[PDB]
Amino acid sequence: QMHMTGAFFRLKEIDQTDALRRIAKGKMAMLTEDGDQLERELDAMYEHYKERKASQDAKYRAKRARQEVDDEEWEGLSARLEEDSSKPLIKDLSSKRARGFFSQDVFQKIPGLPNIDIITAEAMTLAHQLATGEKTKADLIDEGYNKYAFKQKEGLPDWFLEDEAKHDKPIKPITKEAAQAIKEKLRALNARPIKKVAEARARRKLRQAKKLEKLK
Amino acid sequence: EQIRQAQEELAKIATQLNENPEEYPGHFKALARIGETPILAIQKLCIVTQMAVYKDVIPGYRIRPLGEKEVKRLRTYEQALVAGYHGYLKTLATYAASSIPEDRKGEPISSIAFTCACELVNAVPHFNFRGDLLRILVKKLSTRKIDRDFVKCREALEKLFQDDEEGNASQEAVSLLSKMMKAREYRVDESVLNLFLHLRLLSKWEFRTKKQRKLLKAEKEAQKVMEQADATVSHEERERIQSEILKMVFATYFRILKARVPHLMGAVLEGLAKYAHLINQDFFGDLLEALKDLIRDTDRDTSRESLLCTVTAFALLEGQDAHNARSDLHLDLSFFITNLYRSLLSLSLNPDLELGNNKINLQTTTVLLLRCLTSVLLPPWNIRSVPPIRLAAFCKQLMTLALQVPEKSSQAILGLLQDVVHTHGRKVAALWNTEERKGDGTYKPLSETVEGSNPFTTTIWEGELLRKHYCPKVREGLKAMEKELRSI
Amino acid sequence: DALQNLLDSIEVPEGWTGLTDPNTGKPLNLSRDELELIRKVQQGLIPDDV
Amino acid sequence: EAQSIGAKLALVIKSGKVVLGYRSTLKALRSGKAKLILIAANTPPLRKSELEYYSMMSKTPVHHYSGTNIELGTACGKLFRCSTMAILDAGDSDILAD
Amino acid sequence: PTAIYFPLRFHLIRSLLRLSRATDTYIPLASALLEVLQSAEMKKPRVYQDGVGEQVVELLSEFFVLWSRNIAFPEFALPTIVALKRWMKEMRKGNKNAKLGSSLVVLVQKLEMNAKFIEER
RNA sequence: GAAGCCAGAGGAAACUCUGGUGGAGGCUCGCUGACGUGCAAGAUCGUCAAAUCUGAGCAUGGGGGCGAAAG
């Protein structure tokens, strides 16, 4: 009861064939312009640089491992031996393979065989200005002709565009009511339930009690 | 035979994929070519066999598209597995959408196609194209029929809900169920609405060389660092998935309450009472006020809707966390107590009070009334700090309602008043004693407030009319009730 | 309706602002033409059509 | 048939001529008079493959016993683990005709 | 339910009323008799609606005159008068049965008075 | 003196008793406060601090309030 608690040579797929008869003979043998291609590699190192730099944090390695793939990504399918010039062995004490496979349980039970979403606080600031009578439709169109206008982003490489987006954010102020609208828009549905607010108040009361104990 | 020679060739493919799968990558596609035989039998045994191989072969991880010797061997075999499994799901879906009536010797293709789908749903889900698996199930669950395949598709989804801990499989299922219910304009069988109630997220010396010893040490520290990172990410992901599921679940709940679908809104209030404590604190008072607006709308069948929303409000404050937040969250149930008091005279007159393990979705109106009075008169919390005047107000009215109600309902009400005397005793003992009757004012039966009826200025005499009622269980009910009156 | 307000709390409207209209006390919402203008200014890809 | 395959095994132990264990199995194969070779499931693969190699060279049938070494010893009537065993004479059993 | 089998109700109601007068047993007819009254035909606006209206005035009567000497009559009758008080409100706002409406007015004037006149005993 | 082992006697067994072997232990010997729960007129349960000694080298943490945490 305490006992219960590069492949090797096999005779299974060689039994009852001419290959067994050949091997059992025992005769000797031995085994005897537009820059497309340059742009392919430049984006390959840039992706490799991004994944290497982002993987220096332990949180991202955990997020990437638990991240799934997208079916929107998988789309496209539908929608010499140098030779010399010179009854089975495995028996099962009982086709049998076809009988064995269809004696499985599963075969026996079967009988009768565009949306615009305002996420950034700065877009909220432009929304608060436009919706109130502070900035008109004429003022928004006229002030859109600035130095950040008429700049193309269509065929440009990802390493060029991501460098710009990090270093070309326009500096225009936001309002606190615009930022307040964004957090209350992006608040989750289980962010502030009765259980978590209760333990948060209990934790803060306990923390004051230890301070009074230490001052004692 | 023709049907014979497939069975070895079916067993030919599946057996070597079990032994060494990577050696043979066209055998998935070889399983496809042996499937379009016009003879109906091998269509059956192939679909089961494709279910058999993909259960054993599919790994525990998804595999990315290639894009762009042992590595090329693994890539060819894995990409062949995807193309086979994508094709099997297409031939599963067109087989389930096929015509159901056929010969009575066996169910034709469809129930085998559905039982293959439900087996894959609880064995595959992590692997790709689970939306294609689920879309077969949601399509049958929108058919609005009671049928064995409709039943079979039902336990598959709640098996998925009860067992899924990561939450990705549950989110894709509740997204399709939510989008189906709006597309159908809420004509579902309300077994699929109870599927949201089954969600789980909401609820001996081996020698080692010196190089092996140092590699196993560094692997331990790498796994140690990866353990706190995985624990923090899995916790943060679980809250986020719960946030998205709660948004889609509660949006379906409120759209049913707006559309006023009668059979559906009984199940919504059960889900609402179950899951309100998970959602934000500010929205708890909103739910208690949306229930008020529903009751006012029926006050403009209609007895069941008002009692359903009344017992749901009491079931919200039933919960432990909501009970401790009565002072902070100003949750006053005085509206539901007073509306229950004003409807007791009208409820005795209406004759559809008895029509043949949940809390809200009960069928008969009488037991909905019983559970409302159990909350008002016998609460689990503060049963000794109950206003005796509220006790005396309902005791007189329940005695009055027992006079003009069916036999089973009258026996139940006498059982309820029996429990009030045993629990409260001296508080309501003066009602049956006419010498302890107050003389402050007179009794107002037709009152719009619980406080203003002056219940202690009247005496209960319905026991004279009810020891004479034809049902002796009504007669036995009094003799049990007057027994505890004398036992005080 | 209270059910209507509780739906906007969960599924926020597209043109939602968080403001109150001075003319009517109802919450003030951006129109679809206004939301397109905000997108055009923010990204700056095309200042004006045609 | 697990129950029936232990029936002729118990008979051939108690009627025939059987050697038990790895080394005696090796010597029986070397003499060439072995007629059946039983190999347990939990036998190590290097021991498994060497035993399959000599049986091919000596032309004796093999059987891959489904049970482990303690299971084969219990089937023998013995109280020790037997990973491998060889039949030299079938005795009064039909274990060789099958 | 419903108006096609209405005469089957009234003979069956009288059989229960006969039983409750002989033996001293309570039989609740208040829910059933009012339900037959508040079906669609009375609230939809002619001789047969007067005939079913004048007849049901009777079945309201002997139901209340049986136990009109028992002490629990202020509380027994009370669900019934408040039911017809709503009914006087809807016809003041259905049919044009002024004769049927006037007969029920006297009936609830009766039930209130015997409720009042028993409270001093 | 714990499992475990040896021997003898009961019991169909499991176990029981005796005599020994063995030498595990949040066991002993030398010279209480702060809280929480409470669904009553406070009972009952749970958390926290008091944390092998020592030479030579070394790193980090500290206040308040707000907030669900992140900040």
UniProtKB/Swiss-Prot annotation, chain C:
Localization, UniProt: Nucleus, Nucleolus; Nucleus, Nucleoplasm
Coiled coil spans: none
Function: Component of the NOP7 complex, which is required for maturation of the 25S and 5.8S ribosomal RNAs and formation of the 60S ribosome.
Subunit record text: Component of the NOP7 complex, composed of ERB1, NOP7 and YTM1. The complex is held together by ERB1, which interacts with NOP7 via its N-terminal domain and with YTM1 via a high-affinity interaction between the seven-bladed beta-propeller domains of the 2 proteins. The NOP7 complex associates with the 66S pre-ribosome.
Family the entry assigns: Belongs to the WD repeat BOP1/ERB1 family.
Name this polypeptide is given: Ribosome biogenesis protein ERB1
Source species of the chain: Chaetomium thermophilum (strain DSM 1495 / CBS 144.50 / IMI 039719) (Thermochaetoides thermophila)
Full-length numbering of the shown residues: 202 to 251 of 801
